[PDB]
Write a protein that binds this ligand. Structure first.
Ligand SMILES: Cn1cc2c(C(=O)Nc3ccc4c(c3)CNC4)cccc2n1
Lengths: 156, 39
């Protein structure tokens, strides 16, 4: 069905009413989201069906209809925009300067913005509008707030 | 059974709300894709 570029909500009718379990990015006919949102299951776009193409639990990413298309990266200096799409709420751009996740295999940009778990898969953008990663996989710091990594895939 | 609904365009908004801090955190990533704080 709908294959227009943009941000989309991922909904389920399995629970009470219609519940938003996450968000995704449609680009070049490929739907990109976080693995824990769909668990690799098929998606519906009206009367059309989207089937998983690539996925990885450790990276926490999955693509539908084709290979991962998002290859822009955080420059390590500039502010970014989380295009947050919360459950029952309108999409809203929030500007922030990312922090760092220091890991044994290198550093990852991280955004300290607290949103419901149903906001997972919302895109993080650079000043050119390019998706530099997805929001929804990070850690809970000492005061209870969430800090998400800027999770980016690999464009083969 | 999951379905998708359009939420909008992916554009940078000039004059957007600026919030949030920039923390430098030591983290670890396990085989299940779960992050945790290293101390
Ligand atoms: C307090 N809080 C938790 C939040 C999450 C979240 O639980 N993510 C998540 C869930 C399951 C798995 C992964 C990540 C990766 N491996 C499986 C997402 C966005 C906001 C959140 N706030």
């Amino acid at each position: 069905g709908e294959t227009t570029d943009g941000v989309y909500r991922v909904m389920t009718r399995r629970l009470l009413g219609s519940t938003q379990v996450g968000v995704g990015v449609m680009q070049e006919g490929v739907f990109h989201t976080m693995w824990h949102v769909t668990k690799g299951a098929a998606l519906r776009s009206g009367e059309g069906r989207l089937d998983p193409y690539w996925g990885d639990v450790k990276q926490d990413l999955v693509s539908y209809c084709g290979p991962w298309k998002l290859d822009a990266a955080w420059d390590g200096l500039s502010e970014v925009q989380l295009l947050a799409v919360p459950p029952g709420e309108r999409a809203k751009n929030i500007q922030t300067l990312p922090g760092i996740f220091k890991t044994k295999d290198g550093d990852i940009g991280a955004v300290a913005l607290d949103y419901p778990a149903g906001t997972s898969g919302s895109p993080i953008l650079d000043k050119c509008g390019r998706v530099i990663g997805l929001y929804g996989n990070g850690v809970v710091i000492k005061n209870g707030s969430y800090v998400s990594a800027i999770t980016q895939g690999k464009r083969e | 059974d999951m379905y998708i609904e359009r939420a909008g365009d992916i554009t940078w908004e000039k004059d957007a709300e600026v919030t949030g801090n920039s923390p430098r955190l030591d983290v670890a990533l396990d085989e299940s894709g779960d992050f945790s704080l290293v101390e």
